[PDB]
């Protein structure tokens, strides 16, 4: 009949491009790091948000672009911090060697690095929106729920110092799978103000 | 070993693809599936909720000005209250529907809409109007004779304040050059609105839009709806 | 509608709304917080822009569930909500009176999220400011994806929604996070000649199948 | 017995090079851009002229050549753009990053990036040749079905700017394939004078 | 050859074309105008180079399809031509009747299209300008892979070409695109001792089928 | 895993390979075939015409 | 041969895979297991000791 494009599964199972960052390489102190949202763009963003719940597996694929400011071949570390692990401050921290956290060690030269982060949440769906508020008194930040933190993406250059200085970009593209969806919303009409909430000018 | 080759393609990242990827946590068990209610499992299901049509498309209309078509003594006895373009894609009465906004998610859409027209005014406020509805690349009607003599409907609104209007099967994308034209529905006042001396003499009609079950969306997009401050 | 020590004796008792066609259902501590809790009366007017209550924060001071909520920790309920906007047969107007799961609320010509003020109201619940976007950003024309019910005074006077538990988690915490807000919105608004026309509208919400945990 | 050689599926179904163009690489904007048509070369034109109407998936073969005015190993996007969606202008403007275009990302070392594009038209087939006007008024071009458009084809270097400068050469190379074929018509006998249309000069 | 309230009284009623094998059917709103439209005559002489029809812009100002053709917007047809070109026993000459799918015409030593007034003629219809081409860079010789006839005047006077519906779509624009052309080269010129030789040609054209939506 | 190792021929791009590649738009439904008259399924049914 | 094609995540060490990998000492065989007391198979067995 048709009816097997506007599937939400194949509605929202897109990989898009949820970060770009570069970062430089000299003596985010000069690493990669993102929080897993899905807030970043306002194309992704308005698309989850038709929906109240969601409850997919991301699927993250990390493409390293490299420029020398003759490109070297490089071993990247990409690590998964969940929420309630330790993310690191520094290149050199040592919590890069965590026997726990998810790490995956690519090179440029290979095909991206692609890894599927589960379902994260301690509830059964993610909250899209939240009429609530995270902290037990009246200073808790409104829209915030502490269930549906995915975790952060920690991504650094393995190697040690080196003569040349090069910029890295990391592109990360995410693309939701095994995508259920509850209860669906109005799209939103006016431009957002925030990714903290769901402000509106006019 | 196997002796392999490797083929064209080989070692690319296409973001349309479907392979099984590596589990970054395997061993870790999520938390279990529990029913929640109003789950969605295709989008056609979003698009067949009937959703309020800007019918008041006149300029200067703001907010909710837009929402409603009034009728009063100011409207004649045979004049045009407002005419709805059928372009889904286009800046009209279409656009900020749930038939309007999914739909600008995919690029080819066809099925048949309707059109639920809700009479707002007092129990005793009563008259007709004169739904009609004109077929793609016909022109739209500037007189109540000429919108008699095409599809329509003779509303009475004295005691029956709902009107379905079902808009044929289009297949909408099969009709460009840029979206075209879909059709107009337009309405006339037939007689004028009898109001008591009680009632507001001012009454309104609020309109809807849902597809029906043979809609059909195919070809996704981008959304042009959508065009930070506030992780790193 | 008739629960507990509680009765509406109205009368046109029209068709009800299951919400995406649910029945509250107790989940596989439990007379006392099933009853009608009718709030105070709203004056519509002809300038009104709509009101809305979040459950179960309009109920958390109230009664025995208000009583159960600041006892408790963990609550979990559905909602019989009966909406009823008692007016002449010289009124017009049309109400959406619309149920809302997870209405994060959103501030105007701001980046500041709206405060924990702004949000908890109570028993009097607010007035919406922009009701065209909903106070968040996206349209009244769409809200009829959600559950709702219309009041058009010509046809109807009553509404009513029922509610399940609209959770991702199994229980919730009643204090913290609200998960429906009911939602009046008048559409068409009020008309009769003599301007100062003040139709009541009247809500009662009667928790069903209330579940608490952590005395 | 030997008809299986002069089939539709044989006589069609070979790879040849539909687009070959060069862009630079400093501060088509330098990028690729191709409006995926068939009457680019006339040995493939004349071939699909022998027909009225044709369906058949598209199989794009992109091969990339890199000069430095010691080569580089670079990144490279393809990206899809059908008749619905928007090209880029520029080699960074956003469209670069849609969630809903079919993006390939390849290297310079890797065997050449390879998609298939499916049937795009709304009709049953490519009407290869149509007497008709594509404007509903007398301002339409004569011999252009708005139904048939495939898309364009957007190619650009992922990487940001590097201190050399050099031409990248792209190869397009299509093969379609399912292909039926319907009406057969006369072999075009005098040579092309456009792409937009028959004339011929004698 | 009788449809509608036209009719055809011929003589010799010679064998007809299906083209491609194909009669045409209904597609699984439909007397009026399935019936014969005559055009207007043609004169053949010894300096013709041929005649063209394009379907259905040589019936889109005629009649009950004329009619129809300009108040809905999507049409499904096929059609019944008959050509007939009487003569005597002294005159020679050969036409190649050919029904064209999709012929997009070119002009001739220019990179401009044609535009709208000389691809759509109506009931004129139009006059070749290099027929050994077919006017599209091609060629007259391997003409005979369309669905075609001929007219030997020594041998026969008439010729019948059933064309069924020729279009990627399951209806289409009739005012927009024409999908068969009815072409009439003298491929053999007239000929008999008086040089002001002067046979005419008639074509009648029954849409045979007819379909139509949006009125 | 699975011991593999890589022949001559591999990486090529030989224009005369028969290999299924991967779909640029999966879930998209194309156009259905409709019957239009005159298939071709062989060139010599091109030639038998006179 | 096979006509195959890397995917994403081609020659990636993931710190959590569970892949077969190759022995170094193949054709050695171990000390077998002998029955020692306590064996632990879950760590909510030391957990529900108080």
Same mark, same amino acid.
């Not at chain 1, 929906?51 to 997919?56: A, E, G, K, Q, V």
């Not at chain 2, 529907?97 to 406020?125: D, K, P």
């Not at chain 2, 009563?126 to 077929?135: F, M, Q, R, V």
């Given at each position: 009949?048709?009816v097997?494009?506007?599937?939400v599964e194949?509605?929202?199972?897109?990989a898009?491009?949820?970060?770009k960052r570069?970062f430089?390489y000299?003596?985010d102190?000069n690493?990669?790091?993102?929080?897993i949202?899905?807030?970043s763009?306002?194309?992704l963003?308005?698309?989850?948000?038709?929906?109240?719940?969601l409850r997919f597996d991301?699927?993250?694929?990390i493409?390293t672009?490299?420029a020398v400011?003759?490109l070297?071949?490089?071993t990247?570390q990409?690590?998964?911090?969940?929420?309630?692990?330790?993310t690191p401050?520094?290149? /050199?921290?040592?919590?890069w060697?965590s026997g726990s956290?998810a790490?995956?060690?690519?090179?440029?030269?290979?095909?991206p690095?692609?890894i599927?982060?589960?379902?994260?949440?301690?509830?059964?769906?993610?909250?899209?929106?939240?009429d609530?508020?995270?902290?037990?008194e009246?200073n808790?930040?409104?829209?915030?729920?502490?269930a549906?933190?995915?975790?952060?993406?920690?991504?650094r250059?393995?190697?040690?110092?080196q003569?040349?200085?090069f910029?890295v970009?990391v592109?990360?593209?995410?693309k939701?799978?095994?995508?259920?969806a509850w209860?669906?919303?109005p799209?939103?009409?006016?431009?957002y103000?925030s990714?903290?909430?769901?402000?509106?000018?006019? | 070993?196997v002796?392999?080759?490797?083929?064209?393609?080989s070692?690319?990242?296409?973001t349309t693809?479907?392979?099984s990827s590596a589990?970054?946590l395997?061993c870790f068990?999520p938390?279990?599936?529990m029913h929640?209610?109003?789950?969605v499992r295709?989008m056609?299901?979003?698009?067949?909720?009937?959703?309020?049509?800007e019918?008041?498309?006149?300029e200067?209309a703001?907010?909710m000005e837009?929402?409603?078509?009034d009728i009063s003594?100011?409207?004649?006895?045979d004049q045009l209250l407002?005419?709805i373009?059928l372009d889904? #894609?286009?800046?009209?009465?279409?656009r900020?529907?749930l038939?309007?906004n999914?739909?600008?998610?995919?690029t080819?859409?066809?099925?048949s809409?309707?059109?639920?027209?809700?009479?707002?005014?007092?129990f005793?406020a009563?008259?007709?109007?004169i739904?009609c509805?004109t077929?793609?690349?016909?022109?739209?009607?500037?007189?109540?004779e000429?919108?008699?003599?095409?599809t329509?409907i003779?509303?009475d609104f004295?005691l029956?304040?709902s009107?379905?209007?079902?808009?044929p099967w289009?297949?909408?994308?099969?009709?460009r050059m840029?979206?075209?034209?879909v059709?107009?529905v337009?309405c006339?006042? #037939?007689?004028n609105?009898?109001?008591?001396?009680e009632?507001?003499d001012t009454c309104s009609?609020?309109?809807?839009?849902?597809?029906?079950?043979?809609f059909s969306?195919?070809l996704?997009?981008?959304?042009p /709806?959508?065009?930070?401050?506030?992780?790193? | 509608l008739?629960?507990?020590?509680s009765?509406?004796?109205?009368q046109?008792?029209?068709?009800?709304?299951?919400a995406?066609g649910?029945?509250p259902?107790?989940?596989?501590t439990?007379?006392?917080?099933?009853?009608?809790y009718?709030?105070?009366?709203?004056?519509?007017?002809?300038?009104?822009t709509g009101?809305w209550?979040?459950?179960?924060?309009?109920?958390?001071?109230?009664?025995?569930?208000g009583?159960?909520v600041?006892?408790?920790?963990?609550?979990?309920?559905?909602?019989?909500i009966?909406?009823?906007?008692?007016?002449?047969?010289?009124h017009?107007?049309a109400?959406?009176?619309?149920?809302?799961?997870?209405?994060?609320?959103?501030?105007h010509?701001t980046?500041?999220s709206?405060?924990?003020?702004?949000?908890?109201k109570?028993?009097?619940?607010?007035?919406?400011?922009?009701?065209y976007?909903?106070?968040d950003?996206?349209?009244?024309?769409?809200?009829?994806?959600?559950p709702?019910?219309?009041?058009n005074?010509?046809t109807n006077?009553?509404?009513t929604i029922?509610?399940?538990?609209?959770?991702?988690?199994?229980?919730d915490?009643?204090?913290r996070?609200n998960?429906?807000?009911?939602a009046?919105i008048?559409?068409?608004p009020?008309?009769?000649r003599?301007?100062?026309?003040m139709?009541p509208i009247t809500v009662?919400?009667a928790?069903?199948?209330?579940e608490f945990?952590?005395l």
């Amino acid at each position: 009949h048709g009816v097997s494009e506007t599937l939400v599964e194949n509605f929202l199972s897109r990989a898009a491009l949820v970060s770009k960052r570069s970062f430089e390489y000299k003596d985010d102190k000069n690493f990669f790091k993102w929080t897993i949202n899905t807030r970043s763009f306002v194309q992704l963003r308005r698309k989850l948000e038709l929906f109240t719940y969601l409850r997919f597996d991301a699927e993250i694929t990390i493409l390293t672009t490299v420029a020398v400011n003759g490109l070297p071949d490089l071993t990247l570390q990409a690590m998964f911090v969940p929420t309630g692990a330790l993310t690191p401050e520094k290149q /050199d921290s040592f919590h890069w060697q965590s026997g726990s956290n998810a790490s995956v060690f690519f090179k440029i030269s290979d095909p991206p690095a692609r890894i599927t982060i589960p379902f994260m949440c301690i509830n059964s769906a993610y909250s899209v929106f939240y009429d609530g508020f995270a902290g037990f008194e009246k200073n808790g930040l409104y829209g915030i729920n502490p269930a549906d933190t995915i975790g952060n993406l920690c991504v650094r250059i393995v190697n040690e110092h080196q003569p040349v200085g090069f910029t890295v970009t990391v592109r990360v593209y995410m693309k939701p799978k095994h995508i259920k969806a509850w209860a669906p919303r109005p799209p939103r009409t006016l431009p957002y103000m925030s990714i903290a909430n769901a402000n509106y000018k006019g | 070993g196997v002796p392999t080759y490797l083929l064209p393609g080989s070692g690319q990242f296409l973001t349309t693809d479907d392979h099984s990827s590596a589990p970054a946590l395997p061993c870790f068990n999520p938390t279990p599936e529990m029913h929640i209610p109003g789950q969605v499992r295709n989008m056609l299901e979003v698009v067949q909720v009937e959703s309020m049509m800007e019918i008041n498309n006149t300029e200067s209309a703001v907010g909710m000005e837009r929402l409603k078509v009034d009728i009063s003594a100011l409207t004649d006895v045979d004049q045009l209250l407002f005419n709805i373009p059928l372009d889904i #894609q286009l800046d009209g009465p279409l656009r900020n529907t749930l038939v309007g906004n999914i739909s600008r998610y995919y690029t080819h859409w066809s099925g048949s809409l309707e059109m639920t027209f809700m009479f707002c005014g007092s129990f005793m406020a009563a008259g007709k109007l004169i739904l009609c509805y004109t077929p793609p690349g016909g022109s739209c009607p500037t007189t109540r004779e000429t919108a008699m003599l095409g599809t329509h409907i003779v509303w009475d609104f004295g005691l029956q304040s709902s009107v379905t209007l079902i808009i044929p099967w289009i297949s909408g994308s099969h009709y460009r050059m840029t979206n075209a034209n879909v059709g107009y529905v337009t309405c006339f006042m #037939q007689t004028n609105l009898i109001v008591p001396s009680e009632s507001s003499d001012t009454c309104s009609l609020i309109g809807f839009i849902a597809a029906k079950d043979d809609f059909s969306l195919r070809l996704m997009r981008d959304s042009p /709806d959508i065009g930070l401050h506030a992780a790193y | 509608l008739k629960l507990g020590n509680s009765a509406i004796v109205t009368q046109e008792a029209a068709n009800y709304c299951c919400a995406y066609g649910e029945w509250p259902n107790y989940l596989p501590t439990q007379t006392a917080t099933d009853r009608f809790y009718t709030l105070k009366s709203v004056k519509w007017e002809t300038g009104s822009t709509g009101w809305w209550w979040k459950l179960p924060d309009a109920l958390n001071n109230i009664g025995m569930f208000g009583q159960n909520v600041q006892h408790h920790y963990l609550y979990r309920s559905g909602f019989l909500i009966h909406v009823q906007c008692n007016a002449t047969k010289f009124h017009q107007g049309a109400l959406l009176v619309v149920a809302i799961p997870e209405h994060q609320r959103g501030a105007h010509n701001t980046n500041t999220s709206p405060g924990f003020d702004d949000i908890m109201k109570g028993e009097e619940g607010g007035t919406f400011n922009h009701p065209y976007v909903l106070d968040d950003g996206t349209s009244l024309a769409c809200a009829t994806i959600f559950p709702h019910q219309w009041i058009n005074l010509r046809t109807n006077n009553s509404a009513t929604i029922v509610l399940p538990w609209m959770n991702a988690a199994p229980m919730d915490f009643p204090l913290r996070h609200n998960q429906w807000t009911l939602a009046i919105i008048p559409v068409v608004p009020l008309g009769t000649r003599t301007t100062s026309s003040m139709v009541p509208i009247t809500v009662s919400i009667a928790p069903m199948c209330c579940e608490f945990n952590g005395l």
